Amino acid sequence: QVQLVQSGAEVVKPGASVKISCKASGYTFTDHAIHWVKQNPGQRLEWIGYFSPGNDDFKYNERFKGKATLTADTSASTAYVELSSLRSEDTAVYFCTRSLNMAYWGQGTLVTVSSASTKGPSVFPLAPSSKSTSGGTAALGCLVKDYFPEPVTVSWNSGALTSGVHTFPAVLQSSGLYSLSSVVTVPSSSLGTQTYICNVNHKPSNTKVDKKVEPKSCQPREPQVYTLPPSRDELTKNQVSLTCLVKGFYPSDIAVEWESNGQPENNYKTTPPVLDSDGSFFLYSKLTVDKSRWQQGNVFSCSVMHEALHNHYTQKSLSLSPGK
Amino acid sequence: QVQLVQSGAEVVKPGASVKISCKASGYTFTDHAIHWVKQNPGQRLEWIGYFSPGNDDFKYNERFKGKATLTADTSASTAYVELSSLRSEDTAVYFCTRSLNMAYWGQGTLVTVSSASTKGPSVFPLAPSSKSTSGGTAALGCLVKDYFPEPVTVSWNSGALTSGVHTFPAVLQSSGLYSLSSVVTVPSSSLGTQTYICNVNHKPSNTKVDKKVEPKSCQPREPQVYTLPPSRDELTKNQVSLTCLVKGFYPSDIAVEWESNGQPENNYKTTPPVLDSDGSFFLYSKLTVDKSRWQQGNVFSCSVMHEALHNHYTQKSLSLSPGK
Amino acid sequence: DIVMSQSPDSLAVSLGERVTLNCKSSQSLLYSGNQKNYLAWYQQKPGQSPKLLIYWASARESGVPDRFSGSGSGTDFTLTISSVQAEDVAVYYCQQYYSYPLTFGAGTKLELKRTVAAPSVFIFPPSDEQLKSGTASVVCLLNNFYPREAKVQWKVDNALQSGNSQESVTEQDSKDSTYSLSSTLTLSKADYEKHKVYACEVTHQGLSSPVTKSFNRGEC
Amino acid sequence: DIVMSQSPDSLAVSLGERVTLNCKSSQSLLYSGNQKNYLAWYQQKPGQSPKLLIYWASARESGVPDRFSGSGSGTDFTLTISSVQAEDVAVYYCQQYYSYPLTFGAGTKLELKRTVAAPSVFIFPPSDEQLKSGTASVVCLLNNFYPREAKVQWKVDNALQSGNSQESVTEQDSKDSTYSLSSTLTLSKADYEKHKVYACEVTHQGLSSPVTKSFNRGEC
């Protein structure tokens, strides 16, 4: 029930002055003094001073004496800090808080000291790759570009879409404006049936936008070869298994064989190609070897022969890995 | 009625400390001091010192001064000796004993100073040549192999069988582990009608076994299920692959399906069984997930099925491994 | 003026482990009169009003979890979290209220270790709408990886792009403790149209080899 | 410190014989005050809590057989068994408790002599369970023989085995006074299935001619 609501973020002409507010609620305004804390982007928090509504007693931090003027309007139940003749150095977020036991805080007000004028953002869409292309899930988003000053506030499907959302931090462009992106990850399934719109809000310019990001308006295959060691579990048996997975290839015609030193391994069996959900095939090869030969860290490697490979051939090695 | 029961034997890392216990019973703990006797390898007997529960008076033998600390817990009716910063020369049997008239002794605790880790023993059978392929009596036994550290304790048919039993002294193998055999002679007559079980106990690694040695003993095959994670190279791809290798099973009739939480995963493909060089079949199943769910840490598991399994069903789990 | 110094500047801890954060003031915060230590701890998560955790050097606030505890006296204090949790990833601040000006420490930032996670990488071409405007922005997403270190390299018509890109990285997630990064390649509509192959080249630790996702201007 | 010397180091006696074991202390264990000798006799068998037999130089304990008796005074004592039994085979210890530290003698080991007994020989092939592990160990027993001296030779496919076998022999039995020995051949599962004939050839003194027990590789 106790609340401190500060005034909105704003830009301020260098040399100019600005006057932030702190509206107290949920307690007797004249029971605690209001303290003001500046916070430079990142770096150490500085305490500006406090003003005690009630007895009108106040204390400054000598560093801010001269630059700030604490005040309060009891009838209003609000405390003020007025910053004079600003300079870039004054750009920062001013926080108001209550009591020497700073349990309660404002939300902070971002004062940007600049000659530049406020500017609303332009919201463009970051459209998905394509249906099923992602097979599982795809990425879409909004690009909130060229706006000033901070901050903006992106949300998806008006607070509904929250899971897997990533609104990155803003970036100051050489232009002098801010830009930022907000992505989200969703199943390619919904992609197309479900509607995804970002709700961007830049109070400083009183702009609000809701761009709806919608899907974009739109044969041999080189096999991938991955080698896998034997399941830790299988390390109980004498004689372990080395696996070679060759996937995402087309035509189903392929040849897989293993070898260790110059000599070609002999005890292994490959499976028949299997059509994968994407229209290409895959298969596993299973070279068997004595649990001792594998631990001696020998090296084994499967060679795969297929028309789509740079020389119709390729090998990828596999060995016991001396891990840390 | 009078009894002294020491604590178990144990390994001690060089430089480490150990604290043996002697639990008195059948008399008033505070009636007699407890003395501690060390018995170096097979050999020599040294008297460490005594501690008198009751008046808390104690005596040390100069040799042990600074290596041992005698104490007692009257409430518990127990006496202790704590040995500091152990070294090879301290490997020995420590014995607790009551009064200056050493009538009663403990069973002794075998302290083994070593870097080795405790290891449970494997218990194999020494089966009878068979019926009269011995004559009037035949020999059977248990081979307690690869365990550490000393000692283990064999007994037959839970203490019943005692006559003609021979538990040989253990032997240190080049491997670094101990191994030993326990044999017993019995009449070829009983052989086959009477059951013979050897009870092996290795307290150090809290392993108890009860291998029952039978008189020799002269087609479905239980499939082995190993789960493999994605090839580190494949982690370059959004969407990776979880493999399930089911091998050494027969008949070629089997069912493999994945599942994550309570829910069943769907995006997978299993390959047709393939006849292995040993007469059994093997197959691989390939569950495709987004690279980000995998790195999520969740555990996926494949459920295999087959008539040769305990309950025609078994599941093995696999998840991102927090490696060191 | 009392100076508050914290240590370490930042520390990486594995879920469940125990953390101890230091705070040493340049003058005692122990008031002889009542034997109290005028010092407090603050937890602050990116763009958020810091939260008071501990007060009076060791009086845990109403809602703070017991994994949190403060101790110390006079000039040296410490905040300890018995078993860290993902949530606890934040910045911790200590401040003295013994005398004015009220003073803070530079703070210690807590990062949680999770196991190498490789990016999941996507590329987005400029929208038509944005093209109308007269400028083209290509965006490349590196999603949920860990360690933070990651590198993106732009290639237009297999040509190395330099100084015309900008990336922003998220706060490490509260639940899977990862990072996500977005790199934006900004160039004129003109320039954009004048070249044809757009490639993004991701380079992270979980990646066995550099990853590339890309598109070609016309291509739909 | 009082020093206890025992003699002989060890002795072999034939059943029924009468043995005397010596124990000399470096300083009198006879207390002028009560004319008592503070000396005790212990019997100890392999890996077992020793047993007090005699106390105060000559007070046989509650259960000790009469064949046992201790005498002596001051610095020279003796323990005597009138007619040894197979069960008396063990190690005898004398200890002074006149003054701390308590001291023991090095002890005398008593071994019985008996009639030549020939070993009964058995051979056991590796279990299938053990073979699963990748190791094969073949056991050969020499049950209850006399002269300890014995000799086992292994022959795989009528080939002499060397340096890959280990024996263990038991303490002389407490009833029939025999020994028993186990020679274990250890070879890889590989090496084991690669050869066929497994022969154990015992060579004792009670045997007229070397004995051989064996098996052909198979289930039966």
The DSSP bridge pattern shows strands C165-169 and C179-188 to be antiparallel
Query: Does residue A47 contact residue A37 with C-beta atoms inside 8 Å?
Result: yes
Q: What does the alpha-carbon distance between residue C6 and residue C40 come to, in Å, rounded to a whole number?
A: 13
Locus of tokens 């495709």: B288
**H or E, element range at D189:** helix D189-193
Other CB atoms within 10 Å distance of the CB of residue C78 = 18
Tell if the CB–CB gap between B134 and D184 is shorter than 8 Å: no
Are B and A close enough to touch, i.e. 3+ CB pairs under 8 angstroms?
yes
Beta bridge pairs of residue D104: D95
Q: What does the alpha-carbon distance between residue D42 and residue D50 come to, in Å, rounded to a whole number?
A: 6
Q: What does the alpha-carbon distance between residue D125 and residue D192 come to, in Å, rounded to a whole number?
A: 10
Other CB atoms within 10 Å distance of the CB of residue D83 = 13
Query: Does residue A300 contact residue A284 with C-beta atoms inside 8 Å?
Result: no
Q: Phi, psi at residue D87, to the nearest 5°?
A: -70, -5
Nearest C-alpha neighbor of A144 from the set A112, A162, A167: A167
How far, in Å, are B261, C78, C91, C94 from residue C108 at the CA level?
Answer: 37, 12, 6, 9
Domain-ending residue, one of C83, C113, C143: C113
**H or E, element range at D40:** strand D39-44
Beta bridge pairs of residue D216: D197
Parse chain A into domains and list their residue ranges.
Answer: 1-115, 116-218, 219-324
Q: What does the alpha-carbon distance between residue B64 and residue A69 come to, in Å, rounded to a whole number?
A: 78
Residues 6+ apart with CB under 8 A from A192: A131, A215
Q: What does the alpha-carbon distance between residue C94 and residue C1 come to, in Å, rounded to a whole number?
A: 15
- The structure tokens listed for C206 are 């979980």
Task: State whether the Cα torsion B24-B30-B31-B35 is positive or negative.
Answer: positive
Full domain range(s) for residue C178: 114-217
Residues in B closer than 8 angstroms to D126, CB to CB, are 124
Report the amino acid identity of residue D212. T
- How far from the centroid of its chain's Cα atoms is residue B5's Cα? 22
Q: What does the alpha-carbon distance between residue D205 and residue D85 come to, in Å, rounded to a whole number?
A: 24
Q: What does the alpha-carbon distance between residue B311 and residue A211 come to, in Å, rounded to a whole number?
A: 56
- The structure tokens listed for A31 are 């029971």
Locus of tokens 């930022």: A180
Q: Detail the DSSP E strand segments found in D65-210.
A: 68-73, 76-81, 90-96, 103-104, 108-113, 120-124, 135-145, 152-156, 159-160, 165-169, 179-188, 197-202
Mark whether D175 and D194 lie in a shared domain: yes
- How far from the centroid of its chain's Cα atoms is residue A124's Cα? 18
Compute the 3-state secondary structure of chain B and give helix, strand, coil in percent, each to the nearest 5.
Answer: 5, 50, 45
CA-nearest residue of chain C to B238? Answer: C120
Cis peptide before A223 (omega within 30 of 0): no
Per residue, the 3-state secondary structure of B111-175, as one string, reads EEECCCCCECCEEEEECCCCCCCCCCEEEEEEEEEEEECCCCEEEEHHHCCCCCEEECCCEECCC
CB neighbour class for A100 (10 Å; exposed up to 12, middle 13-18, buried from 19): middle
Locus of tokens 């076994």: B209
Q: What does the alpha-carbon distance between residue D89 and residue D112 come to, in Å, rounded to a whole number?
A: 6
CB neighbour class for B287 (10 Å; exposed up to 12, middle 13-18, buried from 19): buried
Task: Provide CATH code, domain A1-115.
Answer: 2.60.40.10
Q: What does the alpha-carbon distance between residue C30 and residue D172 come to, in Å, rounded to a whole number?
A: 78
Tell if the CB–CB gap between B139 and D100 is shorter than 8 Å: no
Q: What does the alpha-carbon distance between residue D180 and residue D173 come to, in Å, rounded to a whole number?
A: 9
Mark whether D109 and D124 lie in a shared domain: no
Q: DSSP assignment, residue A271?
A: P
Task: State whether the Cα torsion D140-D146-D148-D152 is positive or negative.
Answer: negative
With an 8 Å Cβ cutoff, the interface of chain D facing chain B consists of 40, 42, 46-47, 49-50, 52, 55, 61, 93, 95, 97, 100-104, 106-107, 120, 122-124, 126-127, 129-130, 133, 137, 139, 141, 143, 166, 168-170, 180-182, 184, 186, 219-220
Other CB atoms within 10 Å distance of the CB of residue C25 = 25
Residues in B closer than 8 angstroms to D137, CB to CB, are 143, 145, 179
Q: What angle do CA C93, C99, C103 make, to 5 degrees?
A: 25
Q: DSSP assignment, residue A87?
A: -
Q: What is the DSSP string of D74-107?
A: TTEEEEEESS--GGG-EEEEEEE-SSSSPEE---
Counting other chains too, the contacts that B266-270 makes at CB distance below 8 Å and 24 or more residues apart are B267/A135, B267/A136, B267/A277, B269/A274, B269/A275, B269/A276, B269/A277, B269/A282
Q: Which CATH architecture has domain B116-218?
A: Sandwich (2.60)
Query: Does residue D26 contact residue D77 with C-beta atoms inside 8 Å?
Result: no
Q: Which runs of consecutive H residues, i.e. helices, occur in chain B?
A: 291-294
Reduce the DSSP state of residue A88 to 3 states and report it.
helix
Query: Does residue D107 contact residue D22 with C-beta atoms inside 8 Å?
Result: no
Beta bridge pairs of residue D143: D120, D180
* Torsion angle of the four alpha carbons A25, A31, A33, A39, in this order, in degrees rounded to the nearest 10: -40
Q: What does the alpha-carbon distance between residue B109 and residue B80 come to, in Å, rounded to a whole number?
A: 12
**H or E, element range at D44:** strand D39-44
Locus of tokens 């401040």: C95
Task: State whether the Cα torsion B189-B193-B198-B199 is positive or negative.
Answer: negative
Q: What does the alpha-carbon distance between residue D8 and residue D23 come to, in Å, rounded to a whole number?
A: 9
Residues in D closer than 8 angstroms to A290, CB to CB, are 190
Strand A313-319: give its sheet, edge to edge: A255-259, A299-305, A313-319
Locus of tokens 């390994």: B11
Beta bridge pairs of residue B179: B171
Chains touching C, CB cut-off 8 Å, 3+ pairs: A, B
* Torsion angle of the four alpha carbons A168, A169, A173, A177, in this order, in degrees rounded to the nearest 10: 110
Tell if the CB–CB gap between C40 and A107 is shorter than 8 Å: no
Residues in D closer than 8 angstroms to A292, CB to CB, are 134
Other CB atoms within 10 Å distance of the CB of residue B41 = 9
Residues in D closer than 8 angstroms to A291, CB to CB, are 134
- The structure tokens listed for D218 are 């198979």
Tell if the CB–CB gap between A171 and C220 is shorter than 8 Å: no
Reduce the DSSP state of residue B72 to 3 states and report it.
strand
Domain-ending residue, one of C74, C91, C113: C113
Nearest C-alpha neighbor of C185 from the set C175, C195, C171, C177: C195
* Torsion angle of the four alpha carbons C203, C205, C208, C214, in this order, in degrees rounded to the nearest 10: -20
Where does residue B43 fall: left (phi above 0), alpha (psi -120 to 50 degrees), or beta otherwise? beta
- How far from the centroid of its chain's Cα atoms is residue A60's Cα? 39
- b/e map D6-30, b = 16+ CB within 10 Å: beeeeeebeeeeebebbbbbeebbb
Query: Does residue C83 contact residue C76 with C-beta atoms inside 8 Å?
Result: no
- How far from the centroid of its chain's Cα atoms is residue B293's Cα? 38
What is the number of residues in chain A?
Answer: 324
Compute and round to an integer the Cα radius of gyration of chain A: 32
The DSSP bridge pattern shows strands A10-12 and A109-113 to be parallel
Nearest C-alpha neighbor of D192 from the set D216, D211, D212: D216
Counting other chains too, the contacts that C27-32 makes at CB distance below 8 Å and 24 or more residues apart are C27/C2, C27/C75, C27/C98, C28/C74, C28/C75, C28/C98, C29/C2, C29/C57, C29/C74, C29/C75, C29/C77, C29/C96, C29/C98, C30/C73, C30/C74, C31/C98
Reduce the DSSP state of residue B273 to 3 states and report it.
coil
Provide the number of structural domains found in chain C. Answer: 2
- How far from the centroid of its chain's Cα atoms is residue D141's Cα? 17
Across chain B, which distance is largest between two alpha carbons, in Å? Answer: 80
CA-nearest residue of chain C to A174? Answer: C164
CB interface of A with D, residues 221-280, below 8 Å:
238
Among candidates A227, A269, A276 on the partner chain, residue whose Cβ is nearest the Cβ of B231: A227
Compute and round to an integer the Cα radius of gyration of chain C: 24
Mark whether C107 and C5 lie in a shared domain: yes
**H or E, element range at A291:** helix A291-295
- The structure tokens listed for B211 are 């291998």
- How far from the centroid of its chain's Cα atoms is residue B321's Cα? 26
Q: What does the alpha-carbon distance between residue A34 and residue A79 come to, in Å, rounded to a whole number?
A: 7
Nearest C-alpha neighbor of B243 from the set B295, B195, B283: B283
Residues 6+ apart with CB under 8 A from B241: A245, A247, B230, B234, B286, B287, B288, B289
Q: What does the alpha-carbon distance between residue A96 and residue A107 come to, in Å, rounded to a whole number?
A: 8
Nearest C-alpha neighbor of A315 from the set A244, A220, A229: A244
Residues in A closer than 8 angstroms to C133, CB to CB, are 122
How far, in Å, are B7, B10, B21, B96 from residue B203 at the CA level?
Answer: 10, 9, 15, 19
Tell if the CB–CB gap between B168 and D169 is shorter than 8 Å: yes
The DSSP bridge pattern shows strands B10-12 and A122-126 to be unpaired
Q: Phi, psi at residue C55, to the nearest 5°?
A: -135, 160
Q: Does B174 touch chain D (CB under 8 A)?
A: no
Annotation: CATH topology of A219-324: Immunoglobulin-like (2.60.40)
CATH label of the domain that carries residue C54: 2.60.40.10
Tell if the CB–CB gap between B183 and D102 is shorter than 8 Å: no
Nearest C-alpha neighbor of D41 from the set D2, D88, D77: D77
Report the amino acid identity of residue B52. S
Nearest C-alpha neighbor of A277 from the set B287, B259, B261: B287
Mark whether D79 and D129 lie in a shared domain: no
How far, in Å, are B228, B245, D203 from residue B280 at the CA level?
Answer: 21, 13, 46
Report the amino acid identity of residue D1. D
Reduce the DSSP state of residue B14 to 3 states and report it.
coil
Per residue, the 3-state secondary structure of B301-322, as one string, reads EEEEECCCCCCCEEEEEEECCC
Mark whether D190 and D151 lie in a shared domain: yes
**Resolution value, angstrom units:** 2.8
**H or E, element range at B248:** strand B240-249
Q: What does the alpha-carbon distance between residue A119 and residue A207 come to, in Å, rounded to a whole number?
A: 9
Q: Phi, psi at residue C65, to the nearest 5°?
A: -65, 145
Nearest C-alpha neighbor of C102 from the set A231, A101, B185: A101
- Mind telling me how many Å the CA of D93 is from chain B's nearest CA? 9
Query: Does residue A53 contact residue A29 with C-beta atoms inside 8 Å?
Result: yes
Mark whether C95 and C150 lie in a shared domain: no
Tell if the CB–CB gap between C176 and B297 is shorter than 8 Å: yes
Domain-ending residue, one of D113, D131, D147: D113
First to last CA, chain A: 53
Per residue, the 3-state secondary structure of chain C, as one string, reads CCCEEEECCEEEEECCCCEEEEEEECCCCEECCCCEECEEEEEECCCCCCEEEEECCCEECCCCCCCEEEEEECCEEEEEECCCCHHHCCEEEEEECCCCCCEEECCEEEEEECCCECCCEEEECCCHHHHHHCEEEEEEEEEEEECCCCECCEEECCCECCCCEEEEECCCCCCCCCEEEEEEEEEEHHHHHHCCEEEEEEECCCCCCCEEEEEECCCC
Reduce the DSSP state of residue A76 to 3 states and report it.
coil
Nearest C-alpha neighbor of B240 from the set B164, B300, B161: B300
